[PDB]
Amino acid sequence: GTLGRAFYSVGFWIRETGQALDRLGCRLQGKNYFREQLSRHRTLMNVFDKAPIVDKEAFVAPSASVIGDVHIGRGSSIWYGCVLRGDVNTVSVGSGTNIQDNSLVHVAKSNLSGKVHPTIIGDNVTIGHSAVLHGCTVEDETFIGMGATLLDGVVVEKHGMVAAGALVRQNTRIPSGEVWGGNPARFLRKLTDEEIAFISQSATNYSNLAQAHAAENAKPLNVIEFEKVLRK
Amino acid sequence: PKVSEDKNRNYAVVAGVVAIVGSIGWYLKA
Amino acid sequence: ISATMVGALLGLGTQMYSNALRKLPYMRHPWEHVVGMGLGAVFANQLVKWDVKLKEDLDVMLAKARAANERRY
Amino acid sequence: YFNLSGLILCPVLGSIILLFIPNSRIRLIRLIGLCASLITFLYSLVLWIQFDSSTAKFQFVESLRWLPYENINFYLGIDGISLFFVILTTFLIPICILVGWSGMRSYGKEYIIAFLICEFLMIAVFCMLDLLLFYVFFESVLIPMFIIIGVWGSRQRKIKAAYQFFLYTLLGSLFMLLAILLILFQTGTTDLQILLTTEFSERRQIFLWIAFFASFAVKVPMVPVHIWLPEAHVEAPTAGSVILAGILLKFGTYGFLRFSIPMFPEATLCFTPFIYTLSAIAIIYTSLTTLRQIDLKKIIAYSSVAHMNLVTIGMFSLNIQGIGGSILLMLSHGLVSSALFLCVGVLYDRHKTRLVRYYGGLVSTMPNFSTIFFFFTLANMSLPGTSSFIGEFLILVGAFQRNSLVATLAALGMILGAAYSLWLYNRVVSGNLKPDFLHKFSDLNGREVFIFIPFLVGLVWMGVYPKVFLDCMHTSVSNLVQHGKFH
Amino acid sequence: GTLGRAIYTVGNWIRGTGQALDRVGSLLQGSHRIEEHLSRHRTLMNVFDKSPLVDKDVFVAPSASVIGDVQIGKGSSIWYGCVLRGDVNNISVGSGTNIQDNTLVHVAKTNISGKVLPTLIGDNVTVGHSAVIHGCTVEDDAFVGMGATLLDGVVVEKHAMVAAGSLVKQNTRIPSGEVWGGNPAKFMRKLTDEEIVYISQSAKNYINLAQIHASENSKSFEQIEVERALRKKYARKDEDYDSMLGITRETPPELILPDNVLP
Ligand SMILES: CCCCCCCCCCC(CCCCCCCCCC)(CO[C@H]1O[C@@H](CO)[C@H](O[C@@H]2O[C@@H](CO)[C@H](O)[C@@H](O)[C@@H]2O)[C@@H](O)[C@@H]1O)CO[C@H]1O[C@@H](CO)[C@H](O[C@@H]2O[C@@H](CO)[C@H](O)[C@@H](O)[C@@H]2O)[C@@H](O)[C@H]1O
Ligand SMILES: CCCCC/C=C/C/C=C/C/C=C/C/C=C/CCCC(=O)O[C@H](COC(=O)CCCCCCCCCCCCCCCCC)COP(=O)(O)O[C@H]1[C@H](O)[C@H](O)[C@@H](O)[C@H](O)[C@H]1O
Ligand SMILES: CCCCCCCCCCCCCCCCCC(=O)O[C@@H](COC(=O)CCCCCCCCCCCCCCC)COP(=O)(O)OCC[N+](C)(C)C
Ligand SMILES: CCCCCC(=O)OC[C@H](COP(=O)(O)OC[C@H](N)C(=O)O)OC(=O)CCCCC
Ligand SMILES: [Zn+2]
């Protein structure tokens, strides 16, 4: 509670005092390598008492910025450029789903707009590229189109495939096995069975591909490039 | 990596430390 | 209230006042905060001593002035 | 050992803690501010327990040196009169915090800084025996009220409202300061106990009495100078406007009790008809001006002006019962006017019209607000059984015993009080309902319902059993009336 | 000398004390803070066995993530945040293009419809900000609006601007000289010669603009500090004392942009 934040602030104070002592010692020796412009990014950024919990079998890209109370399930992939932010409430990411390139998830930061709704993601949810889910719950086994603009309060239930470029209005549920697209999300047709199988097929292939990357993206730092950067 | 190797900063540093020693003595001895 | 707690509190307060008046977080450098506490305590104690001395050397001079006035007759 | 020093230190600690709190932590700012205010209120209440209403001399005193030769110094203390004012000042401020509780996000922490600053500021005014420093804290309240009126004013015309409230006060303040300088240069000190025991010159008495009256006739609205109060009082936030008529209006009137009546025994007697001929015509002229008014805030302010002009009659009528009735009326008015401005401000915070033309038929809805408004109007209506009637009956008794003519004109005030307040009540919350303007509206929630509970209980308590208030200060009033003369 | 040795020893002692105090402060926090660690993000990585063959003249921003078999021509550039993911099929980016900021290029897994083809981009092609290209086959000298959402199977012809914020649907061909936008195809209007001149001049402008970003992003630590100090020194001028001293101060060449990028 409040007491923990006081100890956190005192921790900052003592940490900065020690850091300044370190800088004085380094600078007294005639070294100024603390003035570099190294990118101070963490792929698992947190706040005082959120500390995002990620499953060990999941894969998170280095460019991903998981912030807040984001929970990641088993086998799900967190691709490059996604901006999953979960400070205000929980952001549950299902098991076996995937969050593609240049996507994100809000929690609707400002509390002025009514009550903040936590984001829930179901299992095997093939979230599309450039998805901007604005704090909406999404049930399992569904597909989200590229460039979708899901807003808060939306309940996309099972098999509710959402067309590309959709702008589904807030608090408007998508019927099961029904596609909604356009500006705004309007009924187009009913979901077919081959696409029903294709959703799970794509989820499985993306999970396997993410496993392959995690196998190859955890390679040691290859100090050859480290020497290349320094020697210039 | 054993000597600062700067024949200009070291005199400033020793001046600073002797200034600190002088300050603490002046507080104490007076 | 012992002329030192007020001095230390005033020094810490003016340290945060200077620090936050530049639009910075209040506790940027704790070391200058503690040295400000020390300087405030020292200045408050010396101010009290200087006030006592000022009154002591003002009375002995006002007495001389009054005595010089009283020799009119 | 609950002395007066802590009562002033606690609001200072509350303000100091609030200064270094980030604006984001809006949850903590309001909580800690309200806690500090309530601790101050309890610390003021506990003083009433250990008051010892027996001695003629002053209660707990704190002396802090202010000049190298101890010529004049901070000398605290209460006798029998400022105690109740201290209690009511400590009680009104938490109500100020509670009324402006919902919208604190826009206000920020600066809202509570000003209120707590003014809080211990008015605390330091009532219990301040030294005459000059009483003026220092007497005009120190300019800055907090200036800021409250200006920064968080309702409408944009607040710029001109604050200028009058400031400059009118400064003129009289410096006119009093000149008299203070004359007294200090003549006597030698400004301590109250000594300065009350100095033989003055009759020619000097009249001039110094006039100089004090220069400002004390501005704090209490008199006939020549009362324009500032309505213009600078309709245009203030409800949480802030509730103490312009709450404690900021009782300085000059109470200043008469402590620094005019026992100070100049031979001048008040010579100037008694002038105060009568001012206040008696004030209660008539202001009351008539009240009738032809449309704004909801201004009518209550004008009623407050009439009440203060009435209490001024009973104060300068030197009687053991006149002064006690004056204090009872001032406390009762501090309760009822505060309640009335909260009642008319809760309407503004929902609809933002401040016009009686739009309001109408508010009994068919929000009946609880209607009941509360009717009760507080009856309290302002001057009915027996409420604390007010105890207030002005003693005023009338004290005035009639001295002069027969002034009592009739004063009672014309409580006759005419039924012309504007009852008309407002029947024209705001008992008319025909109109859906054209007030399309939708709610009722009082748990906050403003609890806000009026202390007001109601104190009103009834001091109306049906005002014994304790009179019991606690019969000695001090007796000492104040019998001064200078020995028969 | 020996004084330098003593000062170095004192520096080591102070560094150790500061690190210990930093450790203590970290422990007092309850270990609720994620340590910064090191930048694990790498440009031009190998997906399975295939490396991206990027030309020498290409500018690839350090934030970009160009993975898979990516073939990028001479003179083109990849900007910040952009992702050239080419895990499955080749992405043959032409010469003289510019995949602008926060753009995503991805290729389907050869089975989105049964006849999937790798993504190809022609020459002198602008893509725009935050565009999404998923299996398209852009040909040479074509304009793509910023935020475009080209899905699979689409082919845009030469000089066939796509409006910004478009949602070009599956297997949609845009004829040369036509401007298509909106959520549906939704043809707007024909081409204008002013607009073709604008396309060509913008395409060449980004090529002669990318090299300054390429140079600045690839400066060594011992060099960037020197440039920072020089920029601080010459932040503001003073003609008074300059004339009084009989001197003139000219900005260093390394702090002056080439005249081609100035308006
Ligand atoms: C700006 C914000 C103000 C907010 C606080 C205002 C309240 C101020 C009261 C707080 C306070 C400190 C003042 C702080 C100044 C702030 C400095 C600002 C810059 C700081 C960065 C002044 O309180 C007392 O100080 C005395 C000093 O003279 C004065 O007493 C008059 O003095 C006579 C002279 O002739 C008069 O003849 C006479 O009538 C009074 O006796 C009065 O000022 C007052 O009584 C606390 O008292 C302090 O002063 C003295 C005596 O207690 C103490 O030192 C003493 O030294 C030896 C003999 O000196 C003693 O042998 C020794 O026992 C003791 O140790 C202190 O330890 C402390 O107790
Ligand atoms: C559990 C732990 C509890 C906690 C333990 C607590 C321990 C308390 C210790 C406090 C240490 C106090 C330190 C006092 C700090 C003073 C300020 C630091 C001064 C300083 O910049 O450094 C030297 C300068 O030198 C002096 O010109 C003058 C500086 C002379 C002063 C140096 C004196 C340091 C001796 C400290 C005693 C050594 C005792 C060692 C203790 C460890 C023993 C194991 C480096 O100059 P520089 O040109 O390269 O660079 C400076 C610097 O970058 C900036 O000031 C400016 O940006 C730049 O313009 C330039 O001025
Ligand atoms: C001389 C002063 C003495 C003390 C003052 C109290 C004396 C009584 C004063 C209040 C009398 C009732 C007046 C209330 C306002 C009347 C208009 C109104 O607002 O009515 C309200 C309030 O109704 C009431 O009258 C409530 C009365 C509560 C007062 C009961 C207490 C009176 C006795 C207390 C006297 C003190 C006892 C001695 C204490 C030591 C709701 O009425 P509805 O029937 O619901 O009609 C509204 C329409 N619609 C339903 C659509 C919303
Ligand atoms: C015990 C810690 C001593 C650490 C001493 C120290 O770090 O000095 C730096 C600071 C400010 O100097 P810079 O702006 O160059 O900080 C440059 C950059 N922030 C850096 O860390 O090098 O000095 C003070 O304000 C303190 C004055 C009072 C000093 C008592
Ligand atoms: Zn894809």
Side-chain angles (χ1 to χ4, degrees):
Chain A
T2 310
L3 206 59
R5 201 260 199 180
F7 287 144
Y8 207 50
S9 72
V10 178
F12 291 167
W13 299 351
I14 301 161
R15 269 178 69 79
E16 199 204 310
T17 295
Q19 198 162 100
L21 266 182
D22 186 74
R23 269 190 272 114
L24 162 67
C26 167
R27 190 195 296 139
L28 175 56
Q29 289 168 346
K31 290 183 312 274
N32 58 352
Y33 62 88
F34 53 88
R35 296 267 286 152
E36 310 182 40
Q37 293 222 48
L38 314 159
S39 179
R40 44 185 314 174
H41 175 71
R42 321 171 269 169
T43 175
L44 266 75
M45 185 180 288
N46 80 313
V47 309
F48 165 52
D49 213 350
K50 287 316 203 318
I53 294 95
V54 288
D55 196 75
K56 297 142 156 180
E57 192 170 354
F59 154 70
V60 296
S63 283
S65 73
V66 172
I67 308 193
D69 203 346
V70 176
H71 285 101
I72 300 294
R74 191 259 284 155
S76 54
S77 62
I78 301 299
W79 284 108
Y80 309 84
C82 57
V83 182
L84 283 72
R85 184 181 60 85
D87 52 292
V88 176
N89 304 117
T90 184
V91 175
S92 174
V93 168
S95 160
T97 179
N98 54 1
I99 317 294
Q100 303 263 18
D101 273 298
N102 278 4
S103 58
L104 61 83
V105 164
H106 291 91
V107 176
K109 42 179 70 156
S110 68
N111 196 30
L112 269 67
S113 298
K115 181 53 63 175
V116 292
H117 316 113
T119 312
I120 306 290
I121 304 296
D123 291 331
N124 314 113
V125 176
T126 311
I127 297 279
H129 297 286
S130 178
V132 184
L133 276 79
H134 190 30
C136 64
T137 175
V138 164
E139 279 192 358
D140 62 8
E141 315 187 15
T142 187
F143 180 84
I144 301 285
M146 281 61 81
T149 309
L150 285 89
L151 307 171
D152 62 358
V154 173
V155 189
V156 174
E157 51 203 10
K158 185 183 51 213
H159 282 100
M161 192 295 267
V162 175
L167 172 83
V168 61
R169 184 151 290 81
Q170 46 198 358
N171 308 291
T172 61
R173 314 201 321 231
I174 305 304
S176 290
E178 166 170 323
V179 299
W180 278 42
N183 193 340
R186 296 288 311 112
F187 173 75
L188 309 186
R189 50 179 169 80
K190 314 282 221 313
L191 183 63
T192 187
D193 296 327
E194 66 265 16
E195 289 166 355
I196 278 168
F198 182 76
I199 286 163
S200 184
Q201 188 174 359
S202 171
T204 302
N205 296 115
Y206 267 107
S207 172
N208 201 357
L209 190 146
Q211 293 264 290
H213 281 87
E216 195 144 348
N217 198 1
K219 267 297 297 203
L221 292 178
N222 199 75
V223 76
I224 301 299
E225 283 101 13
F226 170 84
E227 292 273 12
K228 281 285 288 164
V229 162
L230 289 188
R231 294 331 181 71
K232 268 168 66 39
Chain B
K2 294 181 176 67
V3 174
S4 71
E5 294 171 349
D6 173 339
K7 226 191 201 173
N8 208 337
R9 185 213 312 118
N10 302 302
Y11 303 90
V13 177
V14 65
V17 298
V18 65
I20 296 282
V21 168
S23 190
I24 190 167
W26 198 356
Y27 184 11
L28 271 43
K29 292 300 117 185
Chain C
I1 301 299
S2 47
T4 306
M5 71 77 88
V6 63
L9 265 294
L10 183 63
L12 203 45
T14 187
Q15 185 45 49
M16 279 159 275
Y17 190 14
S18 76
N19 189 359
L21 196 146
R22 294 179 293 172
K23 314 163 72 43
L24 271 68
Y26 285 54
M27 293 263 193
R28 279 289 275 197
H29 304 321
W31 53 89
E32 51 176 70
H33 277 72
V34 67
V35 74
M37 293 177 71
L39 291 203
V42 176
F43 184 60
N45 260 315
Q46 296 294 321
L47 186 44
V48 177
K49 312 330 299 173
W50 186 53
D51 188 358
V52 172
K53 174 270 211 173
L54 271 173
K55 192 53 186 319
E56 183 178 1
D57 302 67
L58 170 64
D59 281 280
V60 308
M61 183 177 177
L62 184 63
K64 168 200 309 155
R66 204 181 61 280
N69 174 279
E70 281 315 271
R71 74 165 290 105
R72 184 181 280 81
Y73 64 91
Chain D
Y1 60 101
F2 293 10
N3 49 53
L4 264 64
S5 67
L7 187 54
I8 316 172
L9 290 186
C10 286
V12 176
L13 321 173
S15 293
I16 284 171
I17 299 300
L18 267 52
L19 279 170
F20 306 141
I21 289 284
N23 285 291
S24 67
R25 295 299 105 75
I26 199 51
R27 296 187 49 77
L28 276 296
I29 290 165
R30 313 170 321 189
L31 271 163
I32 192 66
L34 186 149
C35 294
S37 193
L38 295 196
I39 299 299
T40 304
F41 174 51
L42 295 195
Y43 198 91
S44 86
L45 265 180
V46 69
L47 259 64
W48 197 11
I49 295 317
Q50 46 166 56
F51 177 54
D52 186 74
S53 160
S54 65
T55 49
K57 303 282 171 323
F58 291 98
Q59 303 301 326
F60 293 100
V61 295
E62 311 296 320
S63 180
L64 169 70
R65 186 176 66 106
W66 199 65
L67 284 190
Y69 323 107
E70 301 96 330
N71 193 8
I72 60 172
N73 53 3
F74 291 115
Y75 189 76
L76 282 193
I78 61 177
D79 186 16
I81 297 169
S82 71
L83 163 68
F84 282 160
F85 298 122
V86 161
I87 294 178
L88 193 151
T89 305
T90 49
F91 161 71
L92 268 188
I93 299 283
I95 301 314
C96 295
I97 309 301
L98 277 169
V99 58
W101 180 268
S102 66
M104 192 86 58
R105 185 141 57 190
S106 61
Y107 296 147
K109 67 180 178 296
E110 311 86 330
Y111 205 82
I112 315 301
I113 308 304
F115 268 94
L116 290 203
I117 280 179
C118 193
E119 206 278 345
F120 64 91
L121 208 54
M122 302 157 298
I123 284 184
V125 176
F126 294 126
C127 51
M128 171 75 38
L129 294 175
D130 189 283
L131 188 153
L132 167 70
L133 303 157
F134 166 79
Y135 164 84
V136 164
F137 297 154
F138 178 84
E139 294 294 328
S140 179
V141 298
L142 286 162
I143 312 159
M145 295 298 102
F146 187 38
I147 292 313
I148 281 174
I149 294 183
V151 184
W152 302 290
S154 298
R155 53 201 71 261
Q156 185 36 41
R157 204 158 157 258
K158 44 185 166 77
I159 301 174
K160 195 56 66 183
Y163 283 171
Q164 325 179 33
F165 160 70
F166 204 52
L167 276 299
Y168 284 60
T169 316
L170 276 296
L171 288 169
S173 75
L174 300 170
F175 284 8
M176 184 180 288
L177 177 69
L178 286 186
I180 302 180
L181 301 202
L182 267 297
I183 295 157
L184 168 70
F185 162 64
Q186 164 185 356
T187 61
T189 55
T190 61
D191 273 28
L192 206 57
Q193 289 102 333
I194 288 173
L195 200 156
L196 288 184
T197 81
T198 47
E199 187 145 48
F200 270 72
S201 176
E202 201 295 335
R203 297 276 312 139
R204 178 129 291 189
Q205 282 284 278
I206 278 171
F207 294 140
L208 300 187
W209 187 96
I210 287 163
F212 284 168
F213 182 76
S215 68
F216 279 168
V218 192
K219 301 300 185 307
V220 63
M222 278 305 204
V223 179
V225 61
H226 63 307
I227 311 168
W228 71 272
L229 184 48
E231 294 186 16
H233 182 74
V234 65
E235 271 165 289
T238 292
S241 170
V242 77
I243 63 175
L244 276 297
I247 301 299
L248 277 296
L249 183 63
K250 274 81 172 180
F251 291 167
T253 305
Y254 154 79
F256 271 129
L257 274 183
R258 186 66 63 85
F259 292 95
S260 183
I261 307 314
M263 282 265 298
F264 303 148
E266 184 178 1
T268 61
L269 191 144
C270 290
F271 272 125
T272 287
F274 178 50
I275 300 299
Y276 282 171
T277 192
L278 265 185
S279 286
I281 76 164
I283 314 172
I284 301 299
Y285 276 122
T286 294
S287 281
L288 294 174
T289 306
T290 300
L291 280 178
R292 284 282 301 130
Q293 289 270 307
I294 54 172
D295 269 10
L296 200 54
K297 297 285 291 295
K298 286 182 181 176
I299 293 178
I300 314 295
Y302 276 139
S303 85
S304 176
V305 169
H307 274 258
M308 294 298 102
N309 291 139
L310 195 143
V311 72
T312 300
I313 284 173
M315 185 179 288
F316 268 40
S317 74
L318 268 297
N319 311 63
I320 176 62
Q321 46 188 346
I323 292 172
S326 163
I327 308 183
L328 270 295
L329 179 49
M330 279 182 327
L331 294 174
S332 174
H333 172 274
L335 291 193
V336 287
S337 65
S338 178
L340 279 165
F341 293 102
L342 311 173
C343 276
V344 298
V346 297
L347 294 174
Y348 182 84
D349 293 293
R350 298 191 173 97
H351 314 74
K352 279 151 284 307
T353 174
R354 265 172 186 170
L355 276 162
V356 184
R357 187 180 183 88
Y358 287 72
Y359 289 123
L362 291 203
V363 57
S364 307
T365 47
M366 51 206 308
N368 306 126
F369 160 82
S370 177
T371 315
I372 289 311
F373 194 13
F374 178 82
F375 198 101
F376 284 137
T377 285
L378 278 188
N380 199 8
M381 191 56 28
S382 82
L383 277 296
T386 78
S387 66
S388 291
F389 171 80
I390 301 299
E392 69 274 15
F393 204 54
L394 275 299
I395 306 314
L396 298 186
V397 164
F400 194 82
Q401 283 186 168
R402 287 271 305 268
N403 191 300
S404 68
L405 176 50
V406 69
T408 297
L409 276 296
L412 288 202
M414 52 66 78
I415 301 299
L416 201 42
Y420 53 89
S421 181
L422 209 65
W423 192 13
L424 188 153
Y425 166 83
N426 286 277
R427 203 171 51 188
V428 170
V429 298
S430 183
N432 55 3
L433 186 52
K434 56 180 72 65
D436 291 331
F437 298 144
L438 301 193
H439 169 60
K440 67 175 182 179
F441 37 76
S442 163
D443 189 358
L444 310 169
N445 59 355
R447 215 175 67 245
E448 311 96 20
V449 161
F450 198 89
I451 280 177
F452 297 128
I453 292 298
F455 278 155
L456 282 194
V457 65
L459 210 47
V460 176
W461 179 24
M462 182 215 298
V464 305
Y465 195 66
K467 177 256 199 175
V468 296
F469 303 90
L470 288 159
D471 190 6
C472 284
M473 65 182 179
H474 269 317
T475 313
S476 297
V477 176
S478 295
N479 299 135
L480 196 157
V481 179
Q482 169 70 73
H483 207 285
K485 64 212 71 193
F486 305 96
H487 62 261
Chain E
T2 176
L3 185 58
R5 201 166 335 268
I7 276 176
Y8 203 95
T9 292
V10 175
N12 290 318
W13 288 25
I14 279 182
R15 181 196 294 273
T17 310
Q19 266 148 32
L21 184 63
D22 185 15
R23 195 185 60 245
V24 164
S26 173
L27 311 193
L28 194 44
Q29 270 174 201
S31 176
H32 292 318
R33 177 151 195 287
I34 313 297
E35 289 65 21
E36 284 256 20
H37 297 309
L38 198 44
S39 198
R40 307 294 298 270
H41 163 57
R42 46 183 63 80
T43 66
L44 314 187
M45 93 165 287
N46 303 285
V47 286
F48 286 92
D49 53 359
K50 55 187 73 66
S51 66
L53 197 152
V54 189
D55 204 43
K56 205 175 65 160
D57 206 7
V58 176
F59 159 62
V60 167
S63 83
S65 75
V66 176
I67 69 172
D69 47 346
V70 186
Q71 195 166 358
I72 301 169
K74 184 138 159 55
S76 54
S77 77
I78 311 301
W79 294 98
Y80 315 93
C82 183
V83 176
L84 276 296
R85 195 210 289 204
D87 178 81
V88 188
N89 301 111
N90 193 86
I91 306 192
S92 179
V93 169
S95 68
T97 59
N98 45 358
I99 316 299
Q100 276 191 53
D101 303 305
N102 269 340
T103 307
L104 163 64
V105 179
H106 195 207
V107 176
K109 309 171 179 180
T110 74
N111 56 6
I112 208 70
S113 74
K115 268 85 182 173
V116 187
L117 297 191
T119 299
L120 194 145
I121 296 90
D123 291 331
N124 297 72
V125 170
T126 185
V127 164
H129 300 292
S130 174
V132 169
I133 296 89
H134 212 267
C136 182
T137 312
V138 183
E139 77 193 62
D140 62 358
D141 197 356
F143 202 115
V144 174
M146 65 182 179
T149 311
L150 303 100
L151 265 295
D152 46 351
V154 300
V155 168
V156 59
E157 279 160 49
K158 48 192 57 51
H159 295 89
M161 201 155 58
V162 184
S166 310
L167 189 62
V168 183
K169 307 206 163 257
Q170 284 68 30
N171 319 294
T172 297
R173 148 162 288 116
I174 298 160
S176 70
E178 275 78 10
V179 181
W180 284 24
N183 284 340
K186 196 262 291 178
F187 170 75
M188 283 74 74
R189 79 219 176 79
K190 266 64 63 180
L191 187 65
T192 81
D193 60 357
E194 294 85 4
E195 207 281 329
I196 192 170
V197 176
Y198 170 92
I199 289 187
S200 175
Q201 73 74 60
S202 170
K204 66 183 73 175
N205 189 359
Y206 283 50
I207 317 304
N208 69 10
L209 184 60
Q211 70 276 17
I212 60 176
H213 278 274
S215 76
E216 187 74 39
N217 289 272
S218 51
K219 279 173 167 19
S220 53
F221 164 77
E222 51 263 7
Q223 203 303 329
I224 187 59
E225 291 315 345
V226 165
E227 281 216 320
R228 162 208 300 289
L230 261 61
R231 205 173 299 114
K232 175 91 51 186
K233 184 148 60 95
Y234 294 120
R236 209 156 290 100
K237 53 211 161 303
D238 178 27
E239 183 178 1
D240 300 332
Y241 212 69
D242 276 16
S243 67
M244 164 184 169
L245 288 197
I247 76 165
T248 186
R249 311 217 190 236
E250 272 155 50
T251 63
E254 47 267 59
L255 295 186
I256 287 287
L257 282 76
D259 274 357
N260 48 10
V261 304
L262 298 183

